[PDB]
Design a protein around this ligand. Sequence first.
Ligand SMILES: NC(=O)[C@H]1CCCN(C(=O)C(F)(F)c2cnsc2Cl)C1
Ligand SMILES: [Zn+2]
Length: 139
Amino acid sequence: SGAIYVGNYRVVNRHLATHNDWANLVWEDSSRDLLVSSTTAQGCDTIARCDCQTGVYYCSSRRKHYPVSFSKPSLIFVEASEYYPARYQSHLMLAVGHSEPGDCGGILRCQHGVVGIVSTGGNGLVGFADVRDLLWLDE
Ligand SMILES: NC(=O)[C@H]1CCCN(C(=O)C(F)(F)c2cnsc2Cl)C1
Ligand SMILES: [Zn+2]
């Protein structure tokens, strides 16, 4: 559960995208687990334009926000799921912290804004799909 709303855009996990998201599709990237779609109401979230490696993420399965140190966006191997076969997912950031499948979509933030969304997890690790490079979300 969870999405980012910036201007006339809505970013979600591509594996959790709805029929409306696909019928108003702007861009989608299987290797990043991302999909952006068109909205009529204007969004108000600020996206970060930085290279921080500390922030705060929201965890639905614990109803608690947590502070984390996280890695730089890179190619990490992700286990086969009902949505994708075993593959390398690009632009992924890892941190020590609790996550369960229903937690995908929770936002990661630093003092500059929205950094990304929960996208992978397991064994006491949590993975975030980076969004700071998508400069067109602001224009
Ligand atoms: N980005 C991916 O390929 C996702 C697809 C859905 C499945 N993915 C997961 O990691 C998970 F839901 F099983 C999970 C398990 N414990 S915490 C999380 Cl998040 C990978
Ligand atoms: Zn930052």
